Design a protein around this ligand. Structure first.
Ligand SMILES: *[C@@H]1O[C@H](CO)[C@@H](O[C@@H]2O[C@H](CO)[C@@H](O)[C@H](O)[C@H]2NC(C)=O)[C@H](O)[C@H]1NC(C)=O
Ligand SMILES: [Cl-]
Ligand SMILES: [Zn+2]
Length: 259
């Protein structure tokens, strides 16, 4: 009953146990810039005070599928059709030695890792779980991550505590830092489109926003994230790597772009 990324119960078999996973509007997708429909009327994606996470420790845990940080309900995402509220944040990366770990592609090119900031329509629904299966219920932000030559301080707020949550299900708290700094510096350029969650149940309620600019972390930072967490509760451990879904069929969907 426990899905994994590759293997007997890998993403290839999700449709079997999770019908929605074989939906017509699944994510991620390979964004082809030539097919992108320019939309000068798309308002800017503006994260309201994502540099102010309050005072309380944030929860950072291990799913055996990814490292996930928790976010206060005070974080509000503007610029979309409805008002969305940040709920969680996590990562996707490739195995040790690979420089391809993102889920979304750009003209068939994948980056080293991808950051997903999951939001939910708190204006039309009570909770995130309520919106998880509502049309346009969720709103995710996809930040593609490349390997730069300088150390990224924004990400150490998470990479510097990965050893505390090595095994699946372990958790911990971290001093609240500026999440805004995890996003690329310029947010003007982005692609919008209707997608789904990239893990079972694969609900098609996500209104995606994949930024065009990328975020960079040292090759050292990428290795830490790649070789620290395990997917098991206890030993023998098993590298929690290759935790990304492969690009899915676009099935005649329009991918808009702010630029
Ligand atoms: C995601 O899907 C929704 C619904 O199919 C799209 O919204 C529709 O947009 C048209 C014109 O753009 C309206 O006439 C419809 O009424 C909208 N549907 C409803 C019921 O809200 C939306 O454009 C898609 N998002 C993107 C940008 O791909
Ligand atoms: Cl089982
Ligand atoms: Zn994700």
């Amino acid at each position: 009953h426990h899905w994994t990324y590759e293997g007997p119960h890998g993403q290839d078999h999700w449709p079997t146990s999770y019908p929605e996973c074989g939906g017509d509007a699944q994510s991620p997708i390979n964004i082809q810039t030539d097919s992108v429909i320019f939309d000068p009327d798309l308002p800017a994606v503006q994260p309201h005070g994502y540099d102010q996470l309050g005072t309380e420790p944030l929860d950072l845990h291990n799913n055996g599928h990814t490292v996930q940080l928790s976010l206060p309900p005070t974080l509000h995402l503007g610029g979309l059709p409805r008002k969305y509220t940040a709920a969680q944040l996590h990562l996707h990366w490739g195995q040790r030695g690979s420089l391809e770990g993102s889920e979304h592609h750009i003209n068939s090119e994948a980056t080293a890792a991808e950051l997903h900031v999951v939001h939910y329509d708190s204006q039309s629904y009570s909770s995130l779980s309520e919106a998880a299966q509502k049309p346009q219920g969720l709103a995710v932000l996809g930040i593609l991550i490349e390997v730069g030559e300088t150390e990224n301080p924004a990400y150490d707020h998470i990479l510097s505590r990965l050893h505390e949550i090595r095994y699946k299900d372990q958790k911990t708290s971290v001093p609240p830092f500026s999440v805004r700094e995890l996003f690329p510096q310029q947010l003007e350029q982005f692609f919008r489109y209707n997608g789904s969650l990239t893990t079972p149940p694969c609900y098609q309620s996500v209104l995606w926003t994949v930024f065009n600019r990328r975020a960079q972390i040292s090759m050292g930072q990428l290795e830490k994230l790649q070789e620290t967490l395990s997917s098991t509760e206890e030993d023998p451990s098993e590298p929690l790597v290759q935790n990304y879904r492969v690009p899915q069929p676009l099935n005649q969907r329009t991918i808009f772009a702010s630029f």
